[PDB]
């Protein structure tokens, strides 16, 4: 049951209803547009989409009327064309002569629409209105005047960011999309509007003026600031990154991107590892040849073959580096597979893979009929996911619940109490909430990574799983990658003090304690910033950032897609793993691989599910079997459960790269002042 | 497997230690346009590009960084690189899912 409809000539068995615009989109012919935007909302303003009915005398907005009953529509009909010229002259009647300076100038949609359709002669002959700027935050550079009131951005704010601070104001001309009152508009999706804004009326200050669109090369890859793994188009003006933009992908970001990630690159430019730096006799860091340093430690770590030596990854690194370091750790007799997050491992969620997986696809989240948040507030760790659940929140009336925090998510949701309390109670169906959890179709249990530490992480996991068991009975970065390859405990809790720790990035865990240092001050530091880990570490190894490396990263869903090369390492630094493939070769325990692709073949042994970059699906261990697998432990719990972030300013700084950022510092200064 | 490596004068280095990366290009997201999106192209991997000691120019070593080629079909592209004996990284066309839209759903209640 789907209606036939004629695009200009040929018949098309179009889906029932659906807008004329979507019909021609289906035939692929493209109507001129502005205010409309899928992944947003339809609106009748900006009637640049007018098209002519096969018979009905007057044109109608293309994104308005759904197609039906064998309609024919002449997109190329002359009356349509006169209509479009008609509108375009009006839009250009006031947009200021700013093309050379407006930063949108390379690809502003308004230009191209002016070329393809708009009449070339001007025939306005009076005076343009122009208006004062409205300052808004550290980021967006509002200029207005170039504003054309496709409300768009407000439809962005009210319907996705969820903030409704900004809005239209006034009537006729003088009406303005600027928010009344000086108050600053900060939000986590504030960055994406710089993408969404039709023209140059809103463009990113940090990137401003720096470059022009026809110039930059546009590499495709994925974000690393989050393990969410959203697709992106990094853009570089020759040998140097210029600006980041989202690259649409249905399973994750879908045309959107975060915000901390959007401005994350800026930190790369500042302080960064360049040459190896030995401690001098004075204890000062001092620049050194790459060769003498690597040979030095290469001989140094042989004495302690067996245990002793203890490599320590950061929170950002690095699939190829982990396989390489893995063979570094098995060719040596004993080893320390130590991540950073204090993630519990007894009862083994790792071996079954699925327990650390987010079982439903995030693409599947809109299908779930209830969500059970645990401690962590999603916006400050999986912002895209927060966008996803909000998206369905409008699409569906489905329930959600906090278990538990006072955190300010944009939408209505039930708030609970304390960990063992509300958790084990609903687990034992003591909570009324357990009932609604019972009648719910495809229930979703959202447990944050932050909640797992909290002194007794294992207890919380056991409690939440029970809830999973009940529903079934009733019926009706640097993280997921390692667990795809079993580097548990991951926690530094193995110690047992082990001499000669080997940081991949001590900028994160070096804040903790240097307790092994009096026993052994020596710490190889393979970072890419002088932050935290470098000062308290002998022997420094310069290393590549994520833009350079081909190395894959795993989506929390378990999708394991890779970043592509962009701008090469800044100085003497090499790609991280390659230093290790050098090291093993020096030790005499040369590893079987050498090329990136040979060692992709080594993922093709040690996993080999990573070598399926977009393929989340698996045989699944089944939740009941995992439950039985964990059933033999069980231990004492406690009420409190507070997510790490809470405030947004807390969100602005996490990994060392973000604190190397100028602009993020400007933002944390901004919200605080 | 019509290998033609001997016929092309290309140095072995660049039929070997680098890879093509076939894909259909993503829409520039600043744009609302769709035209440039379609049709396969055959970008190569980036290599090193430093800086001129004088004037600061982005001096560059690799023979063929800027090369890029359009196509009508992916199979044709893969087969193309195979004729060249090229290493490759084919990627899926990722057309957006069709979506429901309704001006009146905005006015449910």
């Amino acid at each position: 049951n789907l209606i036939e409809v004629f695009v200009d000539g040929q018949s098309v068995m179009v889906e029932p209803g659906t807008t004329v615009l979507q019909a021609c989109e289906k035939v692929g012919m493209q109507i001129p547009r502005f205010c409309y935007h899928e992944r947003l909302s339809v609106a009748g303003n900006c009637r640049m989409c007018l098209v002519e009915i096969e018979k009905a005398p007057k044109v109608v907005a293309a994104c308005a009327m759904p197609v039906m009953k064998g309609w024919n529509i002449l997109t190329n009909s002359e009356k349509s064309k006169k209509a479009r010229e008609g509108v375009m002259e009006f839009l250009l009647a006031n947009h200021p002569l700013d093309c050379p300076i407006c930063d949108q100038g390379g690809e502003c949609d308004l230009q191209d629409q002016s070329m393809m359709f708009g009449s070339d002669r001007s025939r306005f002959l009076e005076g343009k209105r122009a208006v004062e700027d409205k300052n808004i935050g550290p980021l967006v550079k509002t200029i207005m005047t170039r504003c054309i009131q496709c409300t768009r951005c407000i439809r962005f704010a009210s319907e996705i960011a969820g903030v409704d601070d900004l809005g239209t104001t006034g009537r006729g001309n003088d009406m303005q999309v600027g928010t009344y009152i000086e108050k600053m508009f900060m939000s986590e999706l504030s960055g994406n509007i710089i993408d969404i804004c039709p023209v140059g009326a809103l463009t990113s200050k940090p990137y401003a003026f720096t470059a022009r669109p026809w110039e930059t090369r546009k590499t495709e890859s994925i974000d690393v600031m989050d393990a969410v793994g959203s697709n992106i188009v990094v853009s570089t003006r020759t040998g140097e990154v210029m600006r980041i933009l989202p690259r649409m992908h249905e399973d994750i970001n879908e045309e959107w991107i975060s915000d901390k990630t959007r401005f994350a690159y800026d930190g790369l430019k500042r302080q960064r590892l360049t040459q190896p730096m030995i401690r001098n006799e004075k204890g000062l860091l001092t620049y050194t040849t790459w060769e003498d340093a690597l040979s030095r430690v290469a001989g140094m770590l042989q004495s302690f073959q067996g245990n002793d030596v203890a490599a320590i990854a950061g929170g950002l690194v690095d699939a190829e580096a982990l396989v390489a370091l893995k063979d570094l750790l098995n060719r040596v007799d004993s080893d320390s597979l130590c991540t950073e997050e204090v993630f519990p491992t007894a009862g083994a969620g790792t071996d079954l893979r699925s327990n650390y997986l987010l079982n439903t696809t995030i693409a599947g989240v809109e299908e779930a009929d209830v969500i059970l948040l645990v401690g962590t507030n999603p916006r400050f760790e999986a912002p895209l996911f927060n966008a996803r659940i909000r998206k369905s929140w409008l699409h569906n009336d489905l329930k959600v619940a906090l278990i538990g925090s006072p955190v300010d998510l944009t939408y209505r949701y039930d708030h609970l109490g304390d960990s063992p309390k509300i958790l084990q109670d609903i687990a034992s169906g003591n909570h009324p909430f357990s009932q609604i959890l019972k009648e719910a179709k495809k229930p979703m249990v959202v447990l944050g990574s932050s909640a797992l530490q909290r002194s007794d992480g294992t207890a919380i996991l056991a409690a939440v799983s029970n809830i999973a068991q009940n529903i079934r009975l009733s019926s009706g970065a640097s993280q997921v990658a390692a667990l795809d390859l079993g580097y548990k405990p991951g926690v530094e809790a193995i110690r047992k003090n082990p001499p000669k720790v080997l940081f991949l990035l001590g900028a994160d865990g070096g804040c903790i304690t240097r307790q092994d240092l009096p026993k052994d001050c020596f710490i190889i530091y393979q970072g890419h910033h002088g932050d935290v880990g470098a000062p308290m570490a002998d022997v420094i190894l310069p290393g590549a950032a994520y833009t350079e490396k081909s190395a894959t990263y795993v989506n929390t869903e378990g999708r394991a897609q890779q970043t592509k090369v962009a701008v090469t390492p800044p100085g003497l630094a090499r790609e991280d793993w390659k230093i290790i493939r050098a090291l093993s070769e020096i030790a005499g325990m040369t590893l079987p691989y050498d090329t990136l692709d040979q060692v992709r073949s080594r993922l093709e042994e040690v996993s080999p599910n990573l070598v399926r970059y977009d393929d989340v699906e698996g045989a699944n261990y089944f939740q009941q079997a995992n439950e039985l697998s964990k059933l033999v432990n069980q231990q004492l719990l406690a009420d409190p459960l507070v997510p790490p972030q809470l405030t947004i300013k807390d969100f602005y700084m996490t990994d060392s790269i973000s604190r190397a950022s100028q602009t993020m510092a400007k933002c944390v200064k901004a919200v605080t002042e | 497997k019509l290998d033609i490596t001997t016929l092309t004068g290309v140095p072995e280095e660049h039929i070997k230690t680098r890879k093509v990366r076939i894909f259909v290009p993503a829409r520039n997201n600043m744009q609302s346009g769709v035209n440039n999106t379609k049709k396969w192209k055959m970008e190569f991997d980036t290599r090193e590009r430093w800086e001129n000691p004088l004037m600061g120019w982005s001096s560059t070593a690799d023979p063929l960084s800027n090369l890029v080629l359009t196509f009508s079909t992916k199979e044709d592209a893969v087969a193309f690189a195979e004729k060249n004996g090229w290493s490759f990284d084919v990627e899926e066309r990722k057309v957006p899912k069709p979506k429901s839209k309704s001006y009146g759903a905005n006015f449910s209640w």
Binding site: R270, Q271, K282, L284, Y287, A534, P570 | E51, P53
Partner: peptide, 18 residues
Amino acid sequence: YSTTRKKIQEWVPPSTPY
């Protein structure tokens, strides 16, 4: 001559011991 200052401005190890 070269114009537009610098690039990476890489950080260096502190003078103080440990």
